[PDB]
Structure formats: structure tokens, C-alpha cells
């Protein structure tokens, strides 16, 4: 709740700018341990193909 006041609210296209200002909010950076199926939620919300 401290990062979202810098990142704003407007969008370039489909992608919101909050996915682009800080690497802590870009979902393509994954947390370095995964116990869940994070690998399939990444592909359906990405114009960046993994």
C-alpha cells in the first residue's frame, strides 16, 4: 500500500503501468520459492511470452 501511490492508475494499452514502474509488482519476477501452480497463472495474464 506504499508502492501504489507512485505507480498511478493509468494504462498504456491492455497493460496497467503498475506492472511496469517497479520490479516488485511485475508478475514476471517470481518469488524464488513456489509451492503452488504459479507457472500457469503467469501465461494467461501476459503479453510477454514465457
Amino acid at each position: 500500500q506504499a508502492l501504489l501511490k507512485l505507480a498511478g492508475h493509468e494504462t498504456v494499452g491492455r497493460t496497467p503501468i503498475t506492472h511496469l514502474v517497479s520490479a516488485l509488482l511485475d508478475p514476471h519476477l517470481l518469488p524464488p520459492f513456489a509451492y503452488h501452480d504459479v507457472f500457469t497463472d503467469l501465461m494467461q495474464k501476459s503479453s510477454r511470452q514465457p
Binding site: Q1, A2, L3, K5, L6, A23
Partner: protein
């Protein structure tokens, strides 16, 4: 019509033992704040600002963001580099899931440890990278946004390729020191107005 040239910097960071000389100023002494602007007196004595929003029309431009324009001039600057040890180039994928097998093949009979280009810049102070006893620590800091290295292609001789830094902390300590990152983080505090 005599035509001079003028220059002035903006947005620096003084070193750690900060000092003063003046006695008239009381309100800006705290080392948690950092200026992001300078003031330049105009012709008609009107003090104009200079912020990054007034400097945004030539940072955000793809000439500032591609190394293909840069790694073709560096390649003609030093045409036959020493093809170094191929340490941090790529990921040699192997069909293993036993990570204890991959852990044990690599550390078994190793006797001489390599140091990459970028890892031997993050231990250097701000002055020894600028001291003239060091070429290779200074030659490979070509671009701010990017990070260069020596690639074994083509032939038996080397060539220069490029990665992007993508963050602020991937800029090393001699170009953006430790106490600068702390004072930049305190500016992150007072803007969004959070409470720890």
C-alpha cells in the same frame, strides 16, 4: 557575435563526512533529503528551475536505450579483445532433476575460482574505479543503462555483447554508493507518506 558555451550540473551526491561553512541557513541541514533540481539565473534575472520533467525530452528516447549503436563503435575501438573465461554467459541446460548431482559435479575437483566482470566492481570504492591503475574495471562501464562483457564469438577472437541492468541496484557502488541508496529510500518515505 561572440558565442560562449556554459555548463552546470544537477542532482549530485556529496560524500559521507558532510560539512558546512555558512551560518545563515537552518532548514536544509538534514542528510536525509536530496536535491533533484538546480536554479539558473536567466537574462532578465528570473531564477528558472531545472527538473527531470524539464529534462525528459531526451532521456526517454531509443537512442539512449540501445547498445547496437554503441557495441559497433566499441568493437572498432578494441577489435581483438582477450576472450575471457566464459563464466556468466548462459544457462547450459541438462536433463537433470537431481540437483544434488548438479551440486556435486561442479564443486568436486575445483581448484581455481573465477571472478566475473561485474562482481569485481561491487567491492570497489568510488575512487579506485576512477584511478588510472585500472583499465578493465573502467573500460567496461560504457553505458549507464547497460552492462557489457566479452563474448567468445566469432572465431577464436572475442566480441562485445550487452545486457540491460533493469534496476537501480544493478548500477554498482562506485557509480551509485551505499549512502545514496539510503537517502534515496528516505525520499520514497516522505512522498507516499507511509508509516513504518
Amino acid at each position: 557575435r561572440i558565442q560562449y558555451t556554459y555548463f552546470f550540473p544537477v542532482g549530485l551526491h556529496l560524500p559521507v563526512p558532510r560539512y558546512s561553512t555558512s551560518v545563515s541557513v537552518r532548514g536544509v541541514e538534514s542528510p536525509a533529503i536530496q536535491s533533484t533540481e538546480t536554479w539558473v539565473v536567466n537574462k532578465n534575472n528570473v531564477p528558472l528551475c531545472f527538473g527531470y520533467q524539464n529534462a525528459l525530452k531526451s532521456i526517454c528516447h531509443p537512442r539512449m536505450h540501445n547498445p547496437t549503436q554503441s557495441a559497433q563503435a566499441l568493437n572498432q575501438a578494441f577489435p581483438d579483445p582477450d576472450g575471457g573465461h566464459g563464466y556468466g554467459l548462459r544457462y547450459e541446460q541438462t536433463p537433470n532433476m537431481n540437483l544434488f548431482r548438479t551440486f556435486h559435479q561442479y564443486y568436486m575437483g575445483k581448484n581455481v575460482a573465477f571472478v566475473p566482470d561485474v562482481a569485481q566492481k561491487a567491492l570497489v570504492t568510488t575512487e579506485d574505479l576512477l584511478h588510472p591503475t585500472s583499465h578493465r574495471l573502467l573500460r567496461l562501464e560504457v553505458h549507464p543503462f547497460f552492462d557489457f562483457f566479452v563474448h567468445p564469438c566469432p572465431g577464436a577472437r572475442g566480441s562485445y555483447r550487452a545486457t540491460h541492468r533493469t534496476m537501480v541496484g544493478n548500477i554498482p557502488q562506485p557509480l551509485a554508493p551505499r549512502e545514496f541508496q539510503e537517502s534515496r529510500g528516505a525520499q520514497f518515505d516522505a512522498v507516499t507518506n507511509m508509516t513504518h
